[PDB]
């Protein structure tokens, strides 16, 4: 049963977590048409998915040169980690969506627009999230149970989703990617601060769990951005999200590779979706 730590440390999932679990969540390949044309994504449904229950939802973006199938492919096997963690009770059941920034006019930077208009309404009208409807109002009212994360170029996607979708999303997991809006770490932090100001949200209503490896080149630009954000009043640094809203996990020795990055998700995802949650839990 999960308890927050204030400075959680990197820990890979056990090797057995990388093999198939008997309690396997169903993965559905979807196709939809949006502002960037006809595209696909995958939806991971937790084992025992019951559409008359409501589930947290976490959208997770691939990196450069990859696609909507990568994260659940043999090259990453994230679903095995998800299956084992949910079965063992370390992670509460949730829906995980793997879309793509490929296709049409879509880019890693501009994906948030298609995310808002097409991806959320398509996925969350079909599956049971906390969204009672998928109008802008219904999506905004369920923001505390929606998260976005991604690796590398997908980490960049995550930062742009954050700056442009605080109204829709409360939890952010940028992995090995920095925010490319500004000519200094301070410009970056200030853009995020301004987005937060504009949203009207309190510090108890958005959470950032960032991560990378100590040997991942993304560290060079992330670390200064993280330090500049620490200095804002908008962030209270600690992985204990019952107390603060901002943490940066750096895995010793880890390089720029999904082999390591999948473990950041195993470490970080169980931290999401407990603040103002509808279940009665002690974390």
Query: What gap in Å lies between CA 57 and CA 92, rounded to an integer?
Result: 11
- What b-and-e string marks burial along 33-65, b requiring 16 or more CB atoms within 10 Å of the CB? ebebeebbbbbbbbeebeeeeebbbbbbbbbee
CB 41 within 8 A of CB 119: yes
For 166, the token pair is: 């605080």
Q: Which domain holds residue 168?
A: 1-283
Query: What gap in Å lies between CA 111 and CA 157, rounded to an integer?
Result: 7
Give which of 111, 135, 92 is closest to 41, Cα–Cα. Answer: 111
Tell me, in Å, the resolution of the deposited structure: 1.9
The burial of 102, by beta-carbon neighbours within 10 Å (0-12 exposed, 13-18 middle, 19 or more buried), is given as middle
DSSP β-ladder status, 207-213 and 246-251: parallel
The burial of 272, by beta-carbon neighbours within 10 Å (0-12 exposed, 13-18 middle, 19 or more buried), is given as buried
Q: Which residues pair with 45 in a beta bridge?
A: 26
Inter-axis angle of helices 78-87 and 258-268, nearest 10: 30
Task: Count structural domains, the chain.
Answer: 1
Q: Sheet with 26-34: list strands edge to edge.
A: 26-34, 37-45, 94-98, 56-61, 146-151, 171-175, 207-213, 246-251
Helix ranges, 91-232 (H): 111-114, 120-126, 136-140, 153-165, 185-199, 219-230
Distances (CA, A) of 49 to 16, 53, 58, 160, 193: 23, 8, 15, 30, 37
How many other C-beta atoms lie within 10 A of the C-beta of residue 176?
28
CATH number assigned to the domain comprising residue 131: 3.40.50.1820
* Technique used to solve these coordinates: X-ray
CA dihedral for 244, 250, 251, 255, sign (positive or negative): positive
User: Which residues touch 200 (CB under 8 Å, ≥6 apart)?
Assistant: none
Distances (CA, A) of 68 to 64, 118, 214, 231: 11, 15, 27, 36
User: Which residues touch 236 (CB under 8 Å, ≥6 apart)?
Assistant: 203, 243, 244, 245, 246
Query: What gap in Å lies between CA 280 and CA 283, rounded to an integer?
Result: 10
CB 56 within 8 A of CB 119: no
């Amino acid at each position: 049963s999960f308890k927050y730590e204030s400075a959680v440390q990197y820990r890979p999932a056990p090797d057995s977590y990388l093999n198939p679990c008997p309690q396997a969540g169903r993965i559905v390949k979807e196709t939809y048409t949006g502002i960037n044309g006809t595209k696909s994504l995958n939806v991971y449904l937790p084992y025992g998915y019951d559409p008359n229950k409501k589930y947290n939802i976490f959208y997770l973006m691939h990196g450069g040169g990859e696609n909507e199938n990568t994260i659940f492919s043999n090259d990453v096997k994230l679903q095995n980690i998800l299956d084992h963690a949910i079965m063992n009770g370390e992670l509460e059941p949730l829906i995980v969506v793997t879309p793509t920034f490929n296709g049409g006019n879509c880019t890693a930077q501009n994906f948030y627009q298609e995310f808002r208009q097409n991806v959320i309404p398509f996925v969350e009208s079909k599956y049971s999230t906390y969204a009672e409807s998928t109008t802008p109002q219904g999506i905004a009212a369920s923001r505390m149970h929606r998260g976005f994360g991604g690796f590398s170029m997908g980490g960049l996607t995550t930062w742009y989703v954050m700056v442009n979708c605080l109204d829709y999303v409360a939890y952010f997991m940028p992995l090995s990617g920095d925010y490319w809006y500004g000519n200094s770490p301070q410009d970056k932090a200030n853009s995020i601060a301004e987005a937060i100001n504009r949203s009207g949200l309190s510090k108890r209503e958005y959470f950032v769990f960032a991560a990378t490896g100590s040997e991942d080149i993304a560290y060079a630009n992330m670390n200064p951005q993280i330090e500049a954000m620490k200095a804002l009043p908008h962030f209270d640094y600690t992985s204990d999200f019952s107390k603060g809203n901002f943490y940066f996990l750096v895995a010793p020795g880890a390089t720029h590779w999904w082999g390591y990055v999948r473990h950041y998700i195993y470490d970080a995802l169980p931290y999401f979706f407990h603040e103002l949650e509808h279940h009665h839990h002690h974390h």
